Amino acid sequence: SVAYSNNSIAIPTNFTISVTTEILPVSMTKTSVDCTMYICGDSTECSNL
């Protein structure tokens, strides 16, 4: 609790220098997927279906 009054004020007499960090994501992994290889593989019948 701060002692509020209507004729009183507070003023700093010294300072401090501080350093803080911040971490932010930017990009993610790039992937590519082939249909027939994943689903069928090397089966001609599966690809035709």
Partner: protein, 99 residues
């Protein structure tokens, strides 16, 4: 209680959020903007209002010579808010759409 469907309670109750809001209000009334960057420093409210008027390009004597008029205008403006909120039936549609 439904078929495998449950609702979980929030971590923070309404009283805690009310306490946060009250602390913010007390800080901004008794300290100004100083408590948001370091230790809270006391200052009389009319002087804080004079600083804020100075921050938009109006000198301090404009405030210091019209204290009562500005206080009355602020009181009336804050008074009308409850009536404006109650009269309008769709004022809180955004908070109802979620539910």
């Amino acid at each position: 209680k439904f078929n495998g469907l449950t609702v979980l309670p929030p971590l923070l109750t309404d009283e805690m959020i009310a306490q946060y809001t009250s602390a913010l209000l007390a800080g901004t009334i008794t300290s100004g903007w100083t408590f948001g960057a370091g230790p809270a420093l006391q200052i009389p409210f009319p002087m804080q209002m004079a600083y804020r008027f100075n921050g938009i390009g109006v000198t301090q004597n404009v405030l210091y010579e019209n204290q009562k008029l500005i206080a009355n205008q602020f009181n009336s403006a804050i008074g009308k808010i409850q009536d404006s909120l109650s009269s309008t039936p769709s004022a809180l549609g955004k908070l109802q759409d979620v539910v």
